């Protein structure tokens, strides 16, 4: 009756051996499941990080636009007054040339001065006093220039406050 | 600019306390504890927390102190350290203040907590 | 009486020649004046442009800070769930090893199976069914992740509107 | 994003007009002109202007049109082209509207001007 209880045992074990492969295989498919699950959260996270970076590149480009726009305003205010000074420079230079020219004529009219004919030739030259012209004041717009800087500082402060309202929405670790 | 604010000393942070009559609640990612045997006291809420962009970032520990320096309440992040926000803190502070006001205590919040958790 | 009117003329001209140098020199000092004036507006303009650029470098650094802070939140949400999956993986692997181990003992207990003593050695092995364990669901926080992205887009839009309020304050050319 | 808006055609921009009764004002960096002989008409203010960051940047020309298409008013930058702002434009538009409303005209502003000079 004992070779029968061993046959009974052998019978129960080989059927317990088969239930064991269905659960070893079941475990292996559960392992693949979590590896695939955690691979999915990587792709999900990397894509959102990649989407964040594309937003901040747009923002950095807005700032570049604002910066070159503000420096263009300042540099065009510079060239506005510096061009008005350039027309003034050329007026004063022309006025300086008329005086330089006429003085040279007087200087070489007085080298032929003891020729009897000096008077008739030089009575014309005492009369010309071509010295006049009025120049209006040119004023660099300091308020405009300094205001661009002041409200650019304001832009930075409200950017810092904007950032703060964003990060406070989510926990940090 | 990223600063860390310490209302509490190193000893206040490590000192142990017990509630004579315990009262405990989990308020999302924060744990609120108070002794409901404390009556008719002036209490001050002190907190050690980090700040980023001039707003609260992470609470480390918040404790309620009587004028005599004893701990009678506490707000702390759960040991699992699930993330919390300044909203979670502000609501927890309101829960703990109302719990302490039931027994006619007068609760004040440290100036550091006022400047960095609220906007006034 | 004519050599006298020439002496009179010579006299008036050499005194008119001296007034002419004081005005040629006066003109030259006026020229230096405007060159120095327009040099001053350059220095003034360049310094304000240099001050603008230092503001925008602070802003670009605020954005870098916000960006690395937001990507740190996303990557720490990723590692929160992926670590919980890793403890799950090691549970399922350990459960798989216990089953693999016990099946090997059953496999080489049934190789010495026709030895009379098989029963006494293998009645122990039908009893162990060490297969259990419950795994709670792990949930990636999509709302949190997507909200960081959504309100980062909001930050960009209010930055664009902030910039607009600045540039409208001053004229463009 | 930097756009240029053209309420007016190429011919409306170059067409010439005269005031039967001239009325002219310089309003800082802008010149305002209108015919005070125009009465009891529905007038529309059309403008060609550039826009940057979704706000008005530079006005090129603004003209007032009757329902019959005739020019009866104008706002233009001074020939010296001194800089102007959207504020200068908005105030000039208010001056010209009040000037035209004296003779009981009804003035409307193009939708492009409403969207980019004001905030409504």
**Per-position b or e across A41-56, b if 16+ CB within 10 A of its CB:** beebbeebbebbeebb
Nearest C-alpha neighbor of A56 from the set C30, C66, C52: C66
Residues of C contacting chain D (CB within 8 angstroms): 160-161, 163-165, 167-173
**Per-position b or e across B59-93, b if 16+ CB within 10 A of its CB:** bebbbbbeeeeebbbbbebeeeeebbbbebbeebb
Task: State phi, psi for C129 to the nearest 5 degrees.
Answer: -125, 65
Helix crossing, A142-167 with A2-109: angle to 10°? 180
- Give how far the C-alpha of residue D41 lies from the chain's centroid of Cα atoms, to the nearest Å: 16
Contact between chains at B81 and A173 (C-beta distance less than 8 A):
yes
Q: Hey, what are C16's tokens? A: 């008119």
CA distance A156 to chain B (A): 12
Q: How much of chain D is helix, strand and coil, in % rounded to 5?
A: 25, 40, 35
Strands (E), D28-77: 30-35, 42-52, 55-66, 71-77
Q: Hey, what are D46's tokens? A: 């059309």
Nearest C-alpha neighbor of C89 from the set C135, C139, C130: C135
**Cβ(A58)–Cβ(C163) under 8 Å?**
no
Cα separation, B34 vs B37, whole angstroms = 9
CATH at residue D90:
3.30.420.330
Q: Nearest by CB to D55, from C164, C171, C173: name it.
A: C164
Strands D2-6 and B106-109, sheet pairing: unpaired
Q: Say yes or no: D78 contacts chain A, CB-CB below 8 A.
A: no
Q: Nearest by CB to D83, from C163, C168, C172: name it.
A: C172
**Cβ(B106)–Cβ(B40) under 8 Å?**
no
Resolution (angstroms) equals 2.8
Q: In terms of C-beta distances under 8 Å and separation of at least 24 residues, what long-range contacts does A6-10 make, across chains too?
A: A6/C113, A6/C116, A6/C118, A6/C119, A9/C118, A9/C119, A9/C122, A9/C123, A9/C126, A10/C110, A10/C113, A10/C118
> What experiment produced this structure?
X-ray
Query: Chains with 3 or more CB pairs closer than 8 angstroms to C?
Result: A, B, D
Chains B and D are in contact, defined as 3 or more C-beta pairs closer than 8 angstroms:
no
C161 contact residues in D (CB cutoff 8 A): 53-54
Cα separation, B15 vs A166, whole angstroms = 35
Domain boundaries, chain A: 1-173
Nearest C-alpha neighbor of D35 from the set D47, D24, D48: D24
Which chain B residue shows the shortest CA-CA distance from C80?
B82
CA distance A166 to chain B (A): 10
Any residues with CB less than 8 A from the CB of A84 and at least 6 apart, and which?
A138
- Give how far the C-alpha of residue A143 lies from the chain's centroid of Cα atoms, to the nearest Å: 23
Q: Which of A145, A146, A151, A154 to mutate: most C Cβ within 10 Å?
A: A145
Cα separation, B109 vs B97, whole angstroms = 9
Structural domain harbouring D109? 1-120
| Structure-token match 């009040």, residue found | D98
Tally Cβ neighbours within 10 Å of residue A166. Answer: 19
- DSSP-derived letter for residue C48 is H
Cα separation, B18 vs B22, whole angstroms = 8
C139 contact residues in B (CB cutoff 8 A): none
Counted domains in chain B: 1
Question: In a 10 Å sphere around its CB, with 0-12 CB exposed, 13-18 middle and 19+ buried, how is residue C55 labelled?
Answer: buried
The interface residues of chain D toward chain A in range 33-52, judged by CB-CB distance below 8 A, are 52
Contact between chains at C62 and A146 (C-beta distance less than 8 A):
no
Cα separation, C159 vs C15, whole angstroms = 71
Question: In a 10 Å sphere around its CB, with 0-12 CB exposed, 13-18 middle and 19+ buried, how is residue B18 labelled?
Answer: exposed
Indicate the helix (H) or strand (E) that contains B64.
Answer: strand B55-66
Q: In terms of C-beta distances under 8 Å and separation of at least 24 residues, what long-range contacts does C123-131 make, across chains too?
A: C123/A9, C125/A13, C125/A16, C126/A9, C126/A12, C126/A13, C126/A16, C128/C102, C130/C98, C130/C99, C130/C102, C131/A23, C131/C95, C131/C99
Which chain C residue shows the shortest CA-CA distance from A141?
C41
D52 contact residues in A (CB cutoff 8 A): 69
Nearest C-alpha neighbor of B25 from the set B105, B117, B113, B93: B93
**Cβ(C167)–Cβ(D57) under 8 Å?**
yes
- Which residue blocks in chain A are alpha helix, DSSP H? 2-109, 118-122, 142-167
| Structure-token match 């940090």, residue found | A172
Q: Hey, what are A163's tokens? A: 């950032």
Cα separation, D81 vs D41, whole angstroms = 32
Q: Which of B3, B50, B51, B53 to mutate: most C Cβ within 10 Å?
A: B53
Three-state DSSP at D36 gives coil
Interface contacts (A, B; CB < 8 Å): 38
Task: State phi, psi for C126 to the nearest 5 degrees.
Answer: -65, -25
C171 contact residues in D (CB cutoff 8 A): 29, 58, 82-85, 88
**Per-position b or e across D84-119, b if 16+ CB within 10 A of its CB:** bbbebbeebbebbbebbeeeebebebbebbeebbee
């Amino acid at each position: 009756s004992l070779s029968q209880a061993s046959a009974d045992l052998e019978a129960t074990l080989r059927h317990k051996l088969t239930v064991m492969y269905s659960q070893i295989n079941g475990a292996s498919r559960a392992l693949d499941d979590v590896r695939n699950r955690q691979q999915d959260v990587r792709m999900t996270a990397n894509r959102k990080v990649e989407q964040l970076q594309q937003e901040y590149t747009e923002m950095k480009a807005l700032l570049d636009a604002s910066e070159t726009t503000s420096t263009r305003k300042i540099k065009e205010e510079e060239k506005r007054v510096n061009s008005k000074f350039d027309t003034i420079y050329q007026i004063l230079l022309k006025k300086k040339s008329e005086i330089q020219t006429l003085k040279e004529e007087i200087e070489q009219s007085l080298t032929k001065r003891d020729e009897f004919e000096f008077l008739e030739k030089a009575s014309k030259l005492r009369g010309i006093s071509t010295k006049p012209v009025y120049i209006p004041e040119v004023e660099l717009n300091h308020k405009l220039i300094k205001g661009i800087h002041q409200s650019t500082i304001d832009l930075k402060n409200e950017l810092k406050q904007c950032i703060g309202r964003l990060q406070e929405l989510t926990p940090s670790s | 600019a990223s600063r860390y604010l310490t209302d509490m000393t190193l000893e206040e942070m490590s000192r142990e306390w017990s509630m004579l009559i315990p009262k405990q609640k989990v308020a999302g990612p924060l744990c609120i504890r108070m002794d409901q045997a404390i009556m008719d006291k002036n209490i001050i809420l002190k907190a050690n927390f980090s700040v980023i962009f001039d707003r609260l970032e992470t609470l480390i520990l918040l404790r309620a102190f009587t004028e005599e320096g004893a701990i009678v309440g506490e707000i702390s992040p759960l040991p699992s350290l699930p993330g919390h926000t300044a909203e979670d803190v502000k609501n927890a502070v309101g829960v703990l203040i109302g719990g302490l006001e039931w027994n006619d205590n007068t609760v004040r919040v440290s100036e550091t907590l006022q400047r960095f958790a609220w906007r006034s």
